[model samples]
Target: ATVLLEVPFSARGDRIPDAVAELRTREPIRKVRTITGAEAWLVSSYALCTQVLEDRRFSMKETAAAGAPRLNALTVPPEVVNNMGNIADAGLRKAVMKAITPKAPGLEQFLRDTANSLLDNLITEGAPADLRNDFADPLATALHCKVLGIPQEDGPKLFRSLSIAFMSSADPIPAAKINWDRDIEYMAGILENPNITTGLMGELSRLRKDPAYSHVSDELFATIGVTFFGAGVISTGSFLTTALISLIQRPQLRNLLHEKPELIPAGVEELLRINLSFADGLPRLATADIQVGDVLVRKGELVLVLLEGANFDPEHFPNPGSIELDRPNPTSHLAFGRGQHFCPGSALGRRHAQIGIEALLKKMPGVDLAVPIDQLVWRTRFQRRIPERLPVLW
Candidate 1:
């Protein structure tokens, strides 16, 4: 009997599974059974992953169609699958994009200060601090609240919804829908509240009342708030957490960036390139037959673009395992993905990690894992690969 290789292979954030490289070399595009028990063509290797991402025929929104093979159950409604496009269609993309820039006035300084303050709290408490729950997640929540013009105190409540909101599973998650509805109501309230006069939501609030946009549905206004908050918090928080693990494990590289803080951005680029933060492969439904590597993917097939497979492909990135700061094509990595759905939050996400890492190196120059590397608990059945608690000491 021929058995399919079940993904994601392993959820250990600190290490890439050896099977990834082996499969990339052998069958770059092959059949794999997702958590949903649905069959998908897992596209590894740089060329093929890029092919799937760059081709519009492989539609992200269509993955929500009834009976479509799934990477996991939808946390939001089927319409929410194409949230970014919907935002653009409603003419609010520019405002939302502008509001999210890393250079938004005091945003970078805010990140630096927030990172330092979090580390200060840890230092005051003592060694063996949990970098994930205490520092990374809080920093992410704070940043999202600041960016959304919401009360910082409200961040935790919103943060609590993400675990259920981002699950990767075979069957429908009941709690996910419950949280989704509750969050939408919360966001809808945010749009009407007079206190929201600053960030993305504030701008969205203004747009909502504009005569031109009066025709736009109230549902979209609320959905944007819920989606952006959930996605940003999850991505920034998880990426920074795992990037910290990679740095802690590579003391030489960690110390190098510590000494030459100017090189933090370059080092961050390399870190982003090698990051294993994404757990499930990026999913898209084929609108038509497409040739990927040797396979002729038929229309209506599900294609999973494995980010690490392309990020680590030796053909595109030489000495792929080693984080070489000066790599010519460093940002070419699909960490933020590619083509139409390339992450709009890429710059802000990069700055978050860079500032967090810089602050950590300065705050505790000798920081290392308090627990054994293998002892760190890796999160499973979640969107991003991250340790549950990053216990560390200086």
Candidate 2:
């Protein structure tokens, strides 16, 4: 089965429910040719998708190995891959996770206050706003910088640089190289600075004192911080924007969530299931010949477990297209992915969504689209699924 290149996977989230239903019945594990001429096995079933994600045989590291079949350039180095595996080690992972993971009870309050402060600024200039620029993007970027110990003044530039590095397809390698160099230099400089007292930078500096964490070198530290910023800021911003748009389209659902604030967490999960911000799965290459479902994937072949495809599978999520806020096992959805590569910041992302949506509903209960949905430009060829702008009026 030759998957056509013209299919706009990124922009078609609204229609994903139908597409997934069709694929689940007809082509669960079909061969598709990518735009770059590489062939990949696109796994669309939820059961097989989670299986491929969790299986050690499907290796994320192998994708960077020399001559590995892939659709994109090796943005992350091999050493970085090794470091990610070691991230779960007792010393390094614990230190990093401690610094980043907000205690759930404390997190809810922090997010609520942070979101409202940003939203106040958003509407301070008055109504009829572009949420991406005025609210979601700035708020998300600032939050990541503050939590990660990046200089607040430098947040916008760093966010822009890293966003382009990860997203843009027009010679993305140069931008990636530039950002990589700058990020490494900046992280090293921060480590040397005496004034930085908290957050990931401080944790890394402290870790360097112990001989056990000697493997957590400057480059590895930089990689962790940069990746966290990219993953936490950009993807969360996209989701926040999309979730806000989803609510605007369905006022009744918005009201229901607002009235029962406890349901915000569940609502976020449902939104993630229905409105995936990431178009593709975390890419993995086969370490050896592996049977993914019924297909035989050769060693070193690229396999994309399409997240949107999996979350929308009718078998896994009945009536998957329709937004069911009370989805009992909504957490089973693979929006943050599954297995070893599952996002470490899943809790933080959910907190951001819950707080963001609740605050918006309370403050702007009558908010509606300022522009026609079709007229709003959606980003194409980017890692995160998002609209270029989300203009709304109350």
Candidate 3:
């Protein structure tokens, strides 16, 4: 059956849950034509989505292949494609895993302290506040700069440049390409200075020098820094904004967590599952003919694994629309994705949200919307989902 897909360019958030529900129930896998005229199989079942993600039959590798299906016309080279997996080296992935791995010991106290410090600034400044501008955005920027070894003072500048390069409506490609070349050249210079120590950049330099890891070069290391900064800032900011708005709309749900602080971890998982933060799935191409659900996705065709649809599939998650505080197997959600391409920074992302939420709750237990919820503006873009501004009072 030919389906005229609604891209939901304007205010799609309200319709996503319903659309996903319909697709999962009636058309677990079906073809839809994108606004760009690219035809893709959209999968909505949780079981099939994860299965396809881990299956090598569906390939991210194709994005780099010559004459591969692309959502946009941009040409991606093999090196870039190979780097997507290897850049987050499986071993290094484990190390990062350890770093952000949730340990209950001292976790609450650490976030409590961090939250108070950040909230103190927000309160001291004034009541009418834009959480995205005053809190979420800065905190995300700071956390990334801290991790990457970029000077904290330089964060705002780097944040602006990177944000423009990635999110700007004006063709960001030319600007991004130029800035990328400049960043690599600059990072190479930073390696020569002995004073720079700690953080990902410094560790990357050390990794490059190790004879055992000769596979990692300085150029690749520099690319890591660039990738880390870009991904870190954007995702954190968007997720935080989305989480805050979700909490505001569902005050009863937010209050539930306030009463049972321990539920924060599980709550984070639930939030990730339901919130359309990273609403759209990344595009992947089929390397060979693959049967995903009933749909036969042919080689060289784009397929979108709708994340929201997968998480809310009633077959996997019963009563998926309602927020279950203690979702028995919350990790089954594909918010951070699945397979090798599963987000390496999932742990860090959770921690950031955990901290941000905890702090907001503690500092502003009385927090409420300063204006009507409907009045709040939402961001327009394919890459990120967030509010333009969230005005509040405590």
- Residue-pair clashes per candidate: 0, 0, 0
Instruction: Show the colliding residue pairs in model 1.
Output: none
Candidate 2 Cα outliers beyond 4 Å, as residue runs: 1-8, 104-110, 168-172
Candidate lDDT values, in order: 0.92, 0.74, 0.70
Model 2 Cα displacement at 386 (Å)?
A: 0.9
Index of the highest-lDDT prediction: 1
Answer with 2 or 3, whichever has the higher lDDT.
2
Q: Write the per-residue lDDT of candidate 2 for residues 1-394, one digit (tens) a residue.
A: 9545322245633345355567767878877655456777888889889989999889887776776656565555556665557566535776776666756245457567877887787678777788887778887877777677667787787788755655634233776777777877777777777777667877777676678777655667677777777778888898888888887888888888878988888888888887767756567888888887778889878888888778877778888778886667778989888997877777878877877888888887778899888777777766677778888888
User: Relative to the unseen true structure, what is the C-alpha lDDT of residue 308 in candidate 3, on a scale of 0 to 100?
Assistant: 78
What does candidate 3's lDDT look like per residue over 98-172, in tens digits?
Answer: 433435355445445655776898799888778887788888887776666567787777677554444423122
Off by over 4 Å in 1: none
TM-score of 2: 0.92
Question: Model 1 reaches what TM-score against the true structure?
Answer: 0.99
Model 2, residue pairs in steric clash: none
Model 3 has how many clashing residue pairs? 0
